[PDB]
Amino acid sequence: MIRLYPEQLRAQLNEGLRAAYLLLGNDPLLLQESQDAVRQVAAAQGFEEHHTFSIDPNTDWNAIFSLCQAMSLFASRQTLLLLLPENGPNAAINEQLLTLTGLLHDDLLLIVRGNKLSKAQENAAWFTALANRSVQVTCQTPEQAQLPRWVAARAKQLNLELDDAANQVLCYCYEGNLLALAQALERLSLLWPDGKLTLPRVEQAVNDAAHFTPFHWVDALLMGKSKRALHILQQLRLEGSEPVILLRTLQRELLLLVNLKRQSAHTPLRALFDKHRVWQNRRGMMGEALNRLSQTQLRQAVQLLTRTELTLKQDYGQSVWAELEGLSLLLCHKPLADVFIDG
Amino acid sequence: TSRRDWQLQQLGITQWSLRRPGALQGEIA
Amino acid sequence: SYQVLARKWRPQTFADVVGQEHVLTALANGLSLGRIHHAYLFSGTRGVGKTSIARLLAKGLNCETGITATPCGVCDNCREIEQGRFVDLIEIDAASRTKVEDTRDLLDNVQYAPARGRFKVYLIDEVHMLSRHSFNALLKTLEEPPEHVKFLLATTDPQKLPVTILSRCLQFHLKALDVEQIRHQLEHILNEEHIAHEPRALQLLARAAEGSLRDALSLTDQAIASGDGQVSTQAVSAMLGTLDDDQALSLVEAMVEANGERVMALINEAAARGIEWEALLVEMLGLLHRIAMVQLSPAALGNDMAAIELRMRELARTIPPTDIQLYYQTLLIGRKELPYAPDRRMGVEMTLLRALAFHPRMPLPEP
Amino acid sequence: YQVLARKWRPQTFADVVGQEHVLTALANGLSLGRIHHAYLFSGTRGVGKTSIARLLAKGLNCETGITATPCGVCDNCREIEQGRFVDLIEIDAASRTKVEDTRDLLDNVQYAPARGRFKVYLIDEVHMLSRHSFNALLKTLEEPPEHVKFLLATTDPQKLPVTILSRCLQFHLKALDVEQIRHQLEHILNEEHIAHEPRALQLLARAAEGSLRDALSLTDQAIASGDGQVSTQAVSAMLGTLDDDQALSLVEAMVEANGERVMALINEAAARGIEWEALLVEMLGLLHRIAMVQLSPAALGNDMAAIELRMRELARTIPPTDIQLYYQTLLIGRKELPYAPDRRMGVEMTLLRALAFHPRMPLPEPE
Amino acid sequence: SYQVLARKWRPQTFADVVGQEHVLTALANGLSLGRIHHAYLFSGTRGVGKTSIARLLAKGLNCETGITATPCGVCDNCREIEQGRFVDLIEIDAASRTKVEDTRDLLDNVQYAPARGRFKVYLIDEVHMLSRHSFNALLKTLEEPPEHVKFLLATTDPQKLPVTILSRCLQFHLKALDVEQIRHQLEHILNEEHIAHEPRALQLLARAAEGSLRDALSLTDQAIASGDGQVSTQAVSAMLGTLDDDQALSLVEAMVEANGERVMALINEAAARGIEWEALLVEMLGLLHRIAMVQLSPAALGNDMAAIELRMRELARTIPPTDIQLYYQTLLIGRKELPYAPDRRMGVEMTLLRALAFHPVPLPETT
Amino acid sequence: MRWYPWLRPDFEKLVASYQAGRGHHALLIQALPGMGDDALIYALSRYLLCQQPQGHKSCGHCRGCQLMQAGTHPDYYTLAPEKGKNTLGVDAVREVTEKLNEHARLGGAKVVWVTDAALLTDAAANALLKTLEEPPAETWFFLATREPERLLATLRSRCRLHYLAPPPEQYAVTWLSREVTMSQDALLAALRLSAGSPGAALALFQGDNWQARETLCQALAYSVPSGDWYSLLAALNHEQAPARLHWLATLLMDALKRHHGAAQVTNVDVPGLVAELANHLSPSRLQAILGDVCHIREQLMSVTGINRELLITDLLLRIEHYLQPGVVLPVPHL
Numbered sequence A: 001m002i003r004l005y006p007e008q009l010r011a012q013l014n015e016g017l018r019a020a021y022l023l024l025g026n027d028p029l030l031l032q033e034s035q036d037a038v039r040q041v042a043a044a045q046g047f048e049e050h051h052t053f054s055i056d057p058n059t060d061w062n063a064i065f066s067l068c069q070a071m072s073l074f075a076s077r078q079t080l081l082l083l084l085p086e087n088g089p090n091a092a093i094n095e096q097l098l099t100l101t102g103l104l105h106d107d108l109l110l111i112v113r114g115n116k117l118s119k120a121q122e123n124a125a126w127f128t129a130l131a132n133r134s135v136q137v138t139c140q141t142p143e144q145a146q147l148p149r150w151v152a153a154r155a156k157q158l159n160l161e162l163d164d165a166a167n168q169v170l171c172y173c174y175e176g177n178l179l180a181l182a183q184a185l186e187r188l189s190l191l192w193p194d195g196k197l198t199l200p201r202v203e204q205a206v207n208d209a210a211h212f213t214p215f216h217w218v219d220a221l222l223m224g225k226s227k228r229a230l231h232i233l234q235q236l237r238l239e240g241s242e243p244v245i246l247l248r249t250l251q252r253e254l255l256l257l258v259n260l261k262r263q264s265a266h267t268p269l270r271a272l273f274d275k276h277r278v279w280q281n282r283r284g285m286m287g288e289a290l291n292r293l294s295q296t297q298l299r300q301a302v303q304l305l306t307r308t309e310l311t312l313k314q315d316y317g318q319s320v321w322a323e324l325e326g327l328s329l330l331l332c333h334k335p336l337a338d339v340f341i342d343g
Numbered sequence B: 001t002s003r004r005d006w007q008l009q010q011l012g013i014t015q016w017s018l019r020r021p022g023a024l025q026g027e028i029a
Numbered sequence C: 001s002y003q004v005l006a007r008k009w010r011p012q013t014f015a016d017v018v019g020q021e022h023v024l025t026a027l028a029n030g031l032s033l034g035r036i037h038h039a040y041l042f043s044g045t046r047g048v049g050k051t052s053i054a055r056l057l058a059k060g061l062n063c064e065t066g067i068t069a070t071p072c073g074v075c076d077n078c079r080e081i082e083q084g085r086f087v088d089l090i091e092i093d094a095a096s097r098t099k100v101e102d103t104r105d106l107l108d109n110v111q112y113a114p115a116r117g118r119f120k121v122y123l124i125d126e127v128h129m130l131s132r133h134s135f136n137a138l139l140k141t142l143e144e145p146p147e148h149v150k151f152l153l154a155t156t157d158p159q160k161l162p163v164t165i166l167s168r169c170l171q172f173h174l175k176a177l178d179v180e181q182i183r184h185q186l187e188h189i190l191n192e193e194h195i196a197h198e199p200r201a202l203q204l205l206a207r208a209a210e211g212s213l214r215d216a217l218s219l220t221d222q223a224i225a226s227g228d229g230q231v232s233t234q235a236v237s238a239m240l241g242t243l244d245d246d247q248a249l250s251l252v253e254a255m256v257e258a259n260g261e262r263v264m265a266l267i268n269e270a271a272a273r274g275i276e277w278e279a280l281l282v283e284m285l286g287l288l289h290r291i292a293m294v295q296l297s298p299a300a301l302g303n304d305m306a307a308i309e310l311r312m313r314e315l316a317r318t319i320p321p322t323d324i325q326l327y328y329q330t331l332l333i334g335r336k337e338l339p340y341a342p343d344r345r346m347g348v349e350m351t352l353l354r355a356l357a358f359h360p361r362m363p364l365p366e367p
Numbered sequence D: 001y002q003v004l005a006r007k008w009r010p011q012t013f014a015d016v017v018g019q020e021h022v023l024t025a026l027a028n029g030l031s032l033g034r035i036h037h038a039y040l041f042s043g044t045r046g047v048g049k050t051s052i053a054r055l056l057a058k059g060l061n062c063e064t065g066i067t068a069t070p071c072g073v074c075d076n077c078r079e080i081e082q083g084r085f086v087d088l089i090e091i092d093a094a095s096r097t098k099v100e101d102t103r104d105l106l107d108n109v110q111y112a113p114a115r116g117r118f119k120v121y122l123i124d125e126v127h128m129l130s131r132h133s134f135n136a137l138l139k140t141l142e143e144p145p146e147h148v149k150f151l152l153a154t155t156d157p158q159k160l161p162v163t164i165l166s167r168c169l170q171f172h173l174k175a176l177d178v179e180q181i182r183h184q185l186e187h188i189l190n191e192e193h194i195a196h197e198p199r200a201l202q203l204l205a206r207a208a209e210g211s212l213r214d215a216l217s218l219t220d221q222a223i224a225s226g227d228g229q230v231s232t233q234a235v236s237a238m239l240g241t242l243d244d245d246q247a248l249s250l251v252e253a254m255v256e257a258n259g260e261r262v263m264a265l266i267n268e269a270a271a272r273g274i275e276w277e278a279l280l281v282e283m284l285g286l287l288h289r290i291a292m293v294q295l296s297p298a299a300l301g302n303d304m305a306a307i308e309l310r311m312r313e314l315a316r317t318i319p320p321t322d323i324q325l326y327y328q329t330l331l332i333g334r335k336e337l338p339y340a341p342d343r344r345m346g347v348e349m350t351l352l353r354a355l356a357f358h359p360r361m362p363l364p365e366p367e
Numbered sequence E: 001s002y003q004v005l006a007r008k009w010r011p012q013t014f015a016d017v018v019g020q021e022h023v024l025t026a027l028a029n030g031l032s033l034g035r036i037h038h039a040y041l042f043s044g045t046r047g048v049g050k051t052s053i054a055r056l057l058a059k060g061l062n063c064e065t066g067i068t069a070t071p072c073g074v075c076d077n078c079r080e081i082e083q084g085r086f087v088d089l090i091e092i093d094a095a096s097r098t099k100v101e102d103t104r105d106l107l108d109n110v111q112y113a114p115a116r117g118r119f120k121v122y123l124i125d126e127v128h129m130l131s132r133h134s135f136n137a138l139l140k141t142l143e144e145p146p147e148h149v150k151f152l153l154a155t156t157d158p159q160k161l162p163v164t165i166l167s168r169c170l171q172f173h174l175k176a177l178d179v180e181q182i183r184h185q186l187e188h189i190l191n192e193e194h195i196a197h198e199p200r201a202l203q204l205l206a207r208a209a210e211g212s213l214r215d216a217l218s219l220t221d222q223a224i225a226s227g228d229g230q231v232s233t234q235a236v237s238a239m240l241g242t243l244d245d246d247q248a249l250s251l252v253e254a255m256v257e258a259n260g261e262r263v264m265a266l267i268n269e270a271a272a273r274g275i276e277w278e279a280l281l282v283e284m285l286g287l288l289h290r291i292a293m294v295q296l297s298p299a300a301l302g303n304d305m306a307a308i309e310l311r312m313r314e315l316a317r318t319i320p321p322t323d324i325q326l327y328y329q330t331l332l333i334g335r336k337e338l339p340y341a342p343d344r345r346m347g348v349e350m351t352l353l354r355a356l357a358f359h360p361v362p363l364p365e366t367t
Numbered sequence F: 001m002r003w004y005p006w007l008r009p010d011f012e013k014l015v016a017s018y019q020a021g022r023g024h025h026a027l028l029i030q031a032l033p034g035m036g037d038d039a040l041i042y043a044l045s046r047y048l049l050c051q052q053p054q055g056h057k058s059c060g061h062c063r064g065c066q067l068m069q070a071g072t073h074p075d076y077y078t079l080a081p082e083k084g085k086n087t088l089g090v091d092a093v094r095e096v097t098e099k100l101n102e103h104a105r106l107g108g109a110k111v112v113w114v115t116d117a118a119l120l121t122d123a124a125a126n127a128l129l130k131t132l133e134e135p136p137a138e139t140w141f142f143l144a145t146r147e148p149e150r151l152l153a154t155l156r157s158r159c160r161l162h163y164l165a166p167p168p169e170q171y172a173v174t175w176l177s178r179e180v181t182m183s184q185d186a187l188l189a190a191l192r193l194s195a196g197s198p199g200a201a202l203a204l205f206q207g208d209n210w211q212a213r214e215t216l217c218q219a220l221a222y223s224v225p226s227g228d229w230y231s232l233l234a235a236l237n238h239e240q241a242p243a244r245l246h247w248l249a250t251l252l253m254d255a256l257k258r259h260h261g262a263a264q265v266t267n268v269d270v271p272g273l274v275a276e277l278a279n280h281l282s283p284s285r286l287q288a289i290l291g292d293v294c295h296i297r298e299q300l301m302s303v304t305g306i307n308r309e310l311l312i313t314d315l316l317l318r319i320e321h322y323l324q325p326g327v328v329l330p331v332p333h334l
């Protein structure tokens, strides 16, 4: 299994094709670009048909097998594309894929698109069989740290002069949405033939389309950025996520912080992290939080979290978002009147 | 403080004290 | 007679549409340079010009003179598209027909060449209501579109569409029309219609529009009806007062400044319109909580509450936090004791009086 | 015997009580000819939404023409009065809310009206329509045929999508005043030749909140109970509300700390066999009225005139803190009443508790 | 076959219904005067005869002789309704027919003429259990139904019903039956059934009924089953667990003097004897109320407590009224939350501890 | 489901009624857990469904008895919560109501058994009202609960209530000694913890719950001197949290009673722990902790889907906070 990234796939395609291609990831833009590049190279090499299928319980595997076995009159070397479900293949789908790869032919070129497989899903007979003669491209959305580099590279590839302020604005507005950012770059290039982009020019034609996850909100709270946490919370509320997921995601981290603070009186932080198997990349951040919050805090937060949970799950109230915003401000170093805690 | 105040607090009755007499517009003693 | 003010003044040229400069400039440059995408997707709020811009693009994409951003408006194609009875312009209301069969037939219809136009444009409106199988069929048709077929999509909730369909089309997002542009458009329309007006009435109408030109035109028509063929400050103010439904913020503002008669007048006005008292009380609680959080951090107030941003920000700036906390506590107690009050209105009035000119005595740990 | 509500539905703009603004707007619109194609009506129950909608529909289709004062005698007016006109398509959205029904309705809107100049669709209970049904109507509402008009009536306009609200002219109906309800009831009873008294009409108007249909239903119930006449005693028995004099006397006795008088009055009330919950509610209402009078002199209406002066005497002598203490004590007593061993015991214990903590004359302590 | 006393003694005529005089008078007046309404809503507590009143009204409406307030009870229609097989009487268990489809099917059959009766009566039991869509669907037809259909609604939670439905119905409130009426009905039933009884047993059962006749009949049947076919005072006392002796007086005295050991020993002995804790709490509350009332005036003490008068007087001389109020409130709170405690004895002990702080094998066929 | 001897007298009454034909069609039995009300209901239903019973015993060889032993009798509808759930839905009640309309297949009586009336939701309870009020001929209902005051008043008023009295303490202790082998103090403590209901104490002994109780007692003994109640979390975070909270409340109540001075206590096997608990805490603080524990237990048992870990952590943090001087303690209120 040759593992690669979207930024280096072209050379491999220039080197030569293979029996099958795996496009696993989360970002849609990178997956679509890789699929288009692979299809273009295959068409240039002499591939004509472009059969596509979406994996579903109603899908008929007999037709796929017949296509893989039958031969066309005035065409050869057909290509097959599969769209896996978001959850991933199950045991029945695993057996179907095993049969399909058993019927795999050299002329047939197989492409699979979908989310990355978990530890259990990735370990399968069909996956192991394909690994011998497969190339997998990992398409993971870049994080906030790496986004400016990607934006600068894309702008340079398009022959555009992008300022630092413009790059920062584009990163802030379209964080987590590469497709929207690419379309915005295309629109900006179309608007200005000269290709010189300044801060006012980009500002006049940019909106908010950022996409976040609860983990980003929890990390923002831990670091202590009030504005970022509030923006993430507003974006998540507008998206329409379930508050219970946010509460459960925050509960584990809050309980871990409380336990460490209680046990940090007479124990080094490294020993506690090793005991709790805290991930290395987070360790420092965690420590920072453990230093910023006093012991009186992390008890009011727990009380407010419990009150919000009871309000949501008993009274079916609609004021959960306001309480979440209050708790977010509380986690950051702010006074808080303590009337809203209702302690 | 006072026994009466403690008893009223225990009974759950909340005692209200005027804060802005000027807000009221009328003959009040 | 007189048609409808909104329906009559639909823009018919790129110079008539007000605002949305970026979208118009991008479309004009693309048409001039020949860079035309295979699918467009217009998004925004209601009554901003999505359908109007789509129709203008369709008109300019099949003009007899040629592909241009300034269609003549006099040739047969332009006239027929204006009348909405052009052969090639296949406009489909996706909302009325969402089942797979209708979309299947419409997409199968693409195999034929255009009759009397260089392009056969499909204008699908309200695309978010299509069925899943309809989306699958549309994606299958749109993966490899013919050279003579173009798709125009108008939607208000783009997040409903699948990512696959979004990735295949260029998305243009429209913004709010702002107060000044709406006011200028209303002034121009009224001047063209030969109707008397006053600047303050137009300003009030623009403010009440809330970034929607269609709403502004509807309110202008209603005011003209109420004003007996003219727009006047008193008539528009009375109309807005009748339509006003923000009694919670007004009550909070009156209470915070220690006013009694104003609170009674607001309570009577709220009672005049069918309103649930507990809903009003919880709305006031939410407003006070938002003000407190804004005082804690200026970034608390999001973009959702843009209409009343200024007043809430001023209240947060001026009112000390302790008064906000006390008002929140007393209103919470009032909400708690509301169901046992003799009457909902009487209970609300009593709680307002307590928050206005009273102060509870805290238990104060004595031991 | 046809019920009063159905019999006395207004048949002309001169027979509608209140709602001056909407009537004036509709009259001006019909007179000037500026007629829209989508009207929405909002308000609390039983304030004349369907009535005015039907009146407007009759005015549009009158044979004499389009006037704000329909004749009421031509064939179209008579048929609409009898509810069998062919061009007035009345739809109960609550009963038919599925999307296919809306599709079927919209499939045959192009056909010309059978006999009238307009084909008026009147949809009731719009808020019950499904989301797909709401979306399916957008295009038709925006650009309907020239011979089609849509009339919509709903109780909670906040349930509709903002897109629909921007397409139609909105009129909000306000709750009727007590005096208007009393005058309408007096006129109806005079027309029906039924004996009545001013006190009974005042009580019925007070108990009707703001919906005239509730007032008519209560009047019918009172007539049934009163055996062909409306009497103050019959209304009092029906509502089960004791006269304000007894509650006022009890409150005065409690304020002056006269235990024997309070106990004697309670025993007399028990002999009368009145409801204890009603007594507590009346006392709480009296205390609330006194507090509001203290807040402002104008807080007291003429409904209490019979005792007004005496009540006003309590306003200038009792400090506000004592009023608040009594109100809270009675509220707590009413809160805990259900768990008391007996209603009489609960009320007696509440009164004893109020007397014991009297700010000025507490009961003597032991030695 | 054998039927319980609750269902076998269901009233069959307007002369067999105890109390509810105002409702019966109103119904008789309406039937006599010919003023027949199409929407009746009987509301009140449980076990008072809402369903029986509705059935009697329906029987009177569809009697062969005519519309009379005194149904004959012998014609074919009356006996058919009594047997429950009458075609035109549709009894709808709203608690099991809440879905909208059932209501829509019901409302589509309202346009057909009655089979044999002169009216088509719909008797909806527990209408408060229907969904919102069901209520909205009903609204339109219920507002103005055909002339041959009548709607009868029976419920015990009128708050659930939306205001829209309440605004278009004649509401009849049923009062709770007094102790004397329940005792009279019980003695009449027992005399008719040839069952021995004693006045004290009937008085106890009436007091325990809490104003519900169904509860009284159920308790009487339980006593008969466990009383060896005889309603004896001793058997009823044993079944109800009445304190009888002066245990409550000793417990309250121990609590007042703040002697933890004495009260704990008394509670342990009572638990060993196996008494009812709710009865003990009620007795203690009654004793506290009597002590407070006597403290108000020395002559307030009743003549039935002479045997324990003197001791009680001492309490009235040694305990300030505020302490009495505190003890009463604490006991009431303990009674309120007794069911939620892990054990009843634990709840009683917790309440008393709170109060003390106040001070200056033959196996048939089973595995 | 075992037949305890103390159920023999009450049965002898109930069946007698059904022998005379004057039997109520809706019997509601009140009993504590482990009393054996289910066995009584099963015996009554078995007697009713026997075709040719003799005396108070079913024949055991007729078609009805054979089907009952096989557990596939066409009659004898049973309502119980789903295997994965803990509540009875309206759908099952409505299905049983619909099926009750038709005649009895075997020509006998139809028996309906509700496993626990307290588990019924509001919709199911409201739906069952009309069926209970006027059931068809030869239809019998049986409901079991431990606290009839929790049920709806309308539902309660339609049923004849029969109460089972727990046997004398001495008899229960002797029976437990005959059954299980444990110290007298342990038997008394288990019996009192079960509200004096033999069979529940036996179930407590049979499982590992006694070891959990000992672990909780040791943890509390360690924690009380230190004032760090958070350590109790490990001993309370479990699917049986309500039982352990009940045990903690019992310990606190015993400590408070000892502080006030009393001769009878629930926890008889741990005098040292209760004495230490009383010595190290004030009566007001003990009252506050007991109230909070009871409230948390009630919330945990009532609300569905509530996360127990967070609730218990907040409870323990509040308990630790209260012990600090100058803190407003909670007061019960309406």
Ligand SMILES: Nc1ncnc2c1ncn2[C@@H]1O[C@H](COP(=O)(O)OP(=O)(O)O)[C@@H](O)[C@H]1O
Residues within 6 Å of the ligand: C005, C006, C007, C008, C009, C010, C011, C016, C017, C018, C019, C020, C045, C046, C047, C048, C049, C050, C051, C052, C053, C154, C185, C213, C214
């Ligand atoms: N930019 C604009 N300039 C002038 N009129 C506009 C503009 N945007 C919307 N309108 C008005 O709105 C109506 C068209 O609604 P439209 O905005 O196309 O619907 P949507 O954008 O919700 O699809 C027309 O009557 C038109 O006068």
Ligand SMILES: Nc1ncnc2c1ncn2[C@@H]1O[C@H](COP(=O)(O)OP(=O)(O)O)[C@@H](O)[C@H]1O
Residues within 6 Å of the ligand: D004, D005, D006, D008, D009, D010, D015, D016, D017, D018, D019, D044, D045, D046, D047, D048, D049, D050, D051, D153, D212, D213, D216
């Ligand atoms: N403005 C009004 N003038 C006279 N009667 C009215 C008015 N509004 C309501 N009513 C009375 O209320 C009853 C029901 O009105 P209805 O048509 O149901 O209004 P809505 O549609 O708002 O419920 C009618 O019998 C009518 O007489």
Ligand SMILES: Nc1ncnc2c1ncn2[C@@H]1O[C@H](COP(=O)(O)OP(=O)(O)O)[C@@H](O)[C@H]1O
Residues within 6 Å of the ligand: E005, E006, E007, E008, E009, E010, E011, E016, E017, E018, E019, E020, E045, E046, E047, E048, E049, E050, E051, E052, E154, E185, E213, E214
């Ligand atoms: N007023 C009454 N007079 C005589 N019996 C009554 C009365 N009210 C109720 N009952 C008895 O209660 C039983 C059930 O009454 P029910 O119809 O359920 O009233 P509700 O519908 O108010 O519960 C009847 O069998 C009847 O014997």
Ligand code: ALF
Residues within 6 Å of the ligand: C045, C046, C047, C050, C051, C154, C156, D163
């Ligand atoms: F015309 Al729209 F949303 F109101 F597209």
Ligand code: ALF
Residues within 6 Å of the ligand: D044, D045, D046, D047, D049, D050, D153, D155, E143, E164
């Ligand atoms: F018919 Al309505 F409010 F009850 F319009």
Ligand code: ALF
Residues within 6 Å of the ligand: E045, E046, E047, E048, E050, E051, E154, E155, E156, F154
């Ligand atoms: F049948 Al009822 F209250 F109406 F028990």
Ligand SMILES: [Mg+2]
Residues within 6 Å of the ligand: C050, C051, C052
């Ligand atoms: Mg549009």
Ligand SMILES: [Mg+2]
Residues within 6 Å of the ligand: D049, D050, D051, D124, D153
């Ligand atoms: Mg209406």
Ligand SMILES: [Mg+2]
Residues within 6 Å of the ligand: E050, E051, E052, E125, E154
């Ligand atoms: Mg009933």
Ligand SMILES: [Zn+2]
Residues within 6 Å of the ligand: C063, C064, C065, C071, C072, C073, C074, C075, C076, C077, C078
């Ligand atoms: Zn042209």
Ligand SMILES: [Zn+2]
Residues within 6 Å of the ligand: D062, D063, D064, D070, D071, D072, D073, D074, D075, D076, D077
């Ligand atoms: Zn006419």
Ligand SMILES: [Zn+2]
Residues within 6 Å of the ligand: E063, E064, E065, E071, E072, E073, E074, E075, E076, E077, E078
């Ligand atoms: Zn008859």
Ligand SMILES: [Zn+2]
Residues within 6 Å of the ligand: F049, F050, F051, F052, F053, F058, F059, F060, F061, F062, F063, F064, F065
């Ligand atoms: Zn047998």
